[PDB]
Write a protein that binds this ligand. Sequence first.
Ligand SMILES: CC(C)(O)c1coc(S(=O)(=O)NC(=O)Nc2c3c(cc4c2CCC4)CCC3)c1
Ligand SMILES: CC(C)(O)c1coc(S(=O)(=O)NC(=O)Nc2c3c(cc4c2CCC4)CCC3)c1
Ligand SMILES: CC(C)(O)c1coc(S(=O)(=O)NC(=O)Nc2c3c(cc4c2CCC4)CCC3)c1
Ligand SMILES: Nc1ncnc2c1ncn2[C@@H]1O[C@H](COP(=O)(O)OP(=O)(O)O)[C@@H](O)[C@H]1O
Ligand SMILES: Nc1ncnc2c1ncn2[C@@H]1O[C@H](COP(=O)(O)OP(=O)(O)O)[C@@H](O)[C@H]1O
Ligand SMILES: Nc1ncnc2c1ncn2[C@@H]1O[C@H](COP(=O)(O)OP(=O)(O)O)[C@@H](O)[C@H]1O
Lengths: 363, 103, 128, 103
Amino acid sequence: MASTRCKLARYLEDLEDVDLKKFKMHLEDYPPQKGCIPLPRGQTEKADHVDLATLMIDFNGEEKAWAMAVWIFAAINRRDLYEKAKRDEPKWGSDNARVSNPTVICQEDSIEEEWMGLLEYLSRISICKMKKDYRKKYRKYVRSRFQCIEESVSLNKRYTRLRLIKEHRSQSPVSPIKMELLFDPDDEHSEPVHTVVFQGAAGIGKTILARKMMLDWASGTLYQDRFDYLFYIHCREVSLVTQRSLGDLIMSCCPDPNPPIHKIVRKPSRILFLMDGFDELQGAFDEHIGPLCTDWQKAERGDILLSSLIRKKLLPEASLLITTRPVALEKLQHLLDHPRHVEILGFSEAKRKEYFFKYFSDE
Amino acid sequence: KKDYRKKYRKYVRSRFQCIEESVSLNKRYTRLRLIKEHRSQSPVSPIKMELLFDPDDEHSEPVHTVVFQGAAGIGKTILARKMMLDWASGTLYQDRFDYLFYI
Amino acid sequence: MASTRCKLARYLEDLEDVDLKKFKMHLEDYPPQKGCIPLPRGQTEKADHVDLATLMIDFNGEEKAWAMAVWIFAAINRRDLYEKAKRDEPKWGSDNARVSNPTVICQEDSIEEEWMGLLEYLSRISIC
Amino acid sequence: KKDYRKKYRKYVRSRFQCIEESVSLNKRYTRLRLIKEHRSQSPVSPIKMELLFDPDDEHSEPVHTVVFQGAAGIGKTILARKMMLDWASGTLYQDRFDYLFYI
Ligand SMILES: CC(C)(O)c1coc(S(=O)(=O)NC(=O)Nc2c3c(cc4c2CCC4)CCC3)c1
Ligand SMILES: CC(C)(O)c1coc(S(=O)(=O)NC(=O)Nc2c3c(cc4c2CCC4)CCC3)c1
Ligand SMILES: CC(C)(O)c1coc(S(=O)(=O)NC(=O)Nc2c3c(cc4c2CCC4)CCC3)c1
Ligand SMILES: Nc1ncnc2c1ncn2[C@@H]1O[C@H](COP(=O)(O)OP(=O)(O)O)[C@@H](O)[C@H]1O
Ligand SMILES: Nc1ncnc2c1ncn2[C@@H]1O[C@H](COP(=O)(O)OP(=O)(O)O)[C@@H](O)[C@H]1O
Ligand SMILES: Nc1ncnc2c1ncn2[C@@H]1O[C@H](COP(=O)(O)OP(=O)(O)O)[C@@H](O)[C@H]1O
């Protein structure tokens, strides 16, 4: 009963020659954002099976070495060894002494996929690092501000897959791109594109759509999970001469007593601002106002802050979504280039009845 | 996986015993006859418990429907309770199959 | 000037151990220039200086093996080795190899047939 | 494996001592003579403790039966208690063998 190094050596002894060569490449070339360290080519190539297991533990420690072995097994299509290592990770845990009262924890619950997953995050120091603290909080917070009055108590039940004919380039493919990859361009085309705009008549529901679009992705919900953050901002509160910074604008969404904005200032183009209603903007607004803004934290004028944000000169990679009234387009269209115009339409004949299916309680 | 398993198993297991005659069931097993209709247009293959759902070589991998024909009072109601009781502890039954639903 | 392998082996000896590790990594990761095939990781790491020079010649040929070394020396920043490789251009004759049955990439390959006898008669005049 | 081991060992160990003459047994060992009948149709191989069950080169790997012949009062009853007491602590005895059953 020694295992670990010996358990790993046993799987490695099951690799065919071709499999071993590839397993070793992967070790030597291990992808660099796991909290894992690749292994040197000399020692790796030279190592027999038991020595390779020892080398993996010496370089990365037990738990990471095991994770690396599992990933590589999948990668070289040895799914047998992938499933065997996955089922025999806390399998020596069953053959472990109770030691009477648990000094910290019994540790019996490690086979559970959620618990194994927790252990995988736990010792990551990179996946564990602060990723977890940044995620769950933001998600649940953005989620609980749109329900539970004691009519706005159910929203997804009131969905409809509202029409989304996205303006084909104004000088035939369908590509409705309603939710999945709506921001994404066609083949290449424009990878760093960030601006999308929705055109709909007054009262269509473009204000409703943003609340729904938030509510969808505010649980992951197979939405753009490859995108990290979304920022809802309706311009009812936003006004002129406010002289408030983006952080003040940001903290408006979630008033954190300890604003982590220094960590929100991370990975541009990984964060999306959902601006809502240009019509809501009340007051004068020069689309080409003289003074220019580039400072993120400076207390700047409300329209000026938007001016930089709309021009994206501040936060050059930040994505933007702007529900706009068609009549007010010429102001922003002259202001900003390459806008992903999206025409949104109301319910059809049958859909109108289907709305009453959502609404009414009796035939 | 652990939370999905142990619970379902013990639950499906404790609804068929411990009155204070239905207190022992596996003791009342018998390996009841199981001649599975050969295709209606010789191999034995009783397939009583192991791979009873499984076809022959390939044949039909995604097959899902099996039906038992027996006279009224044979014990087909009893068999399901036994077949549940068998696999409700793994018991070297189709452990390569995850869940069973008695109705 | 009979063997380029020996000259390549001497240059491998000149390489520092860190430079040799970089040289092995570069040989394994060699880019596709002049139809040159990169050495497999296991062979490069296990081979000593003499063996690696032989393996470089066996993999592509003496001329390509020397050319790969000159590029690798520049890549590993071994300027003295890179200058020496540019300074010395060995003759492409060949070193001693235990290829009694000749082998070529084509399926037909080569044999110990009449070709050998003809080559021997052509190169062997006085001894016999 | 751990739950099966320690328990069995200490248990088989504490039933042969500590009265308040049978209080020391290994001290009363002696390496008693063990001439194992050569096949009844010269090698020494006393095989007193190590590989006493083990055959010669191959010969009979799955052999299981060994029998001790001794006069009445020799100590064959004592030997089993000692042989248990030896291996009941591993004691570089047949640790490649898992369990022993005294009866
Ligand atoms: C094409 C053009 C210029 O006429 C146009 C495009 O969008 C607008 S708008 O003014 O901003 N939005 C609306 O008018 N919405 C609306 C409509 C009707 C009735 C009602 C509403 C709102 C509640 C009642 C009839 C059709 C449009 C105008
Ligand atoms: C072949 C055909 C059509 O006759 C047939 C096939 O299955 C049935 S059935 O009606 O549904 N089941 C029974 O009849 N079971 C039964 C039988 C006997 C006695 C008793 C019972 C139940 C308790 C007493 C004698 C043989 C059958 C009919
Ligand atoms: C060879 C044959 C047939 O005579 C034989 C082989 O073993 C036995 S036996 O009967 O079962 N065992 C004994 O007799 N033990 C014994 C002996 C002596 C004295 C005493 C004892 C027991 C205490 C006193 C003298 C020699 C033997 C008989
Ligand atoms: N998808 C939808 N399902 C049901 N009702 C909707 C939907 N979209 C909009 N509405 C209706 O529109 C009203 C709000 O419209 P709003 O979002 O303000 O349109 P706009 O933003 O174009 O003015 C709500 O009363 C709601 O009943
Ligand atoms: N394998 C069996 N062993 C003992 N008794 C059985 C067995 N199968 C059925 N029985 C008897 O049959 C009765 C229930 O039969 P049931 O399952 O209702 O048959 P069916 O479902 O064909 O009507 C029970 O009283 C039981 O005693
Ligand atoms: N190895 C030994 N050392 C000391 N005394 C022994 C030994 N073997 C047997 N005896 C003595 O023999 C007696 C028990 O003999 P027993 O094992 O019953 O022989 P058998 O089993 O042949 O009848 C004890 O009183 C003990 O003193």
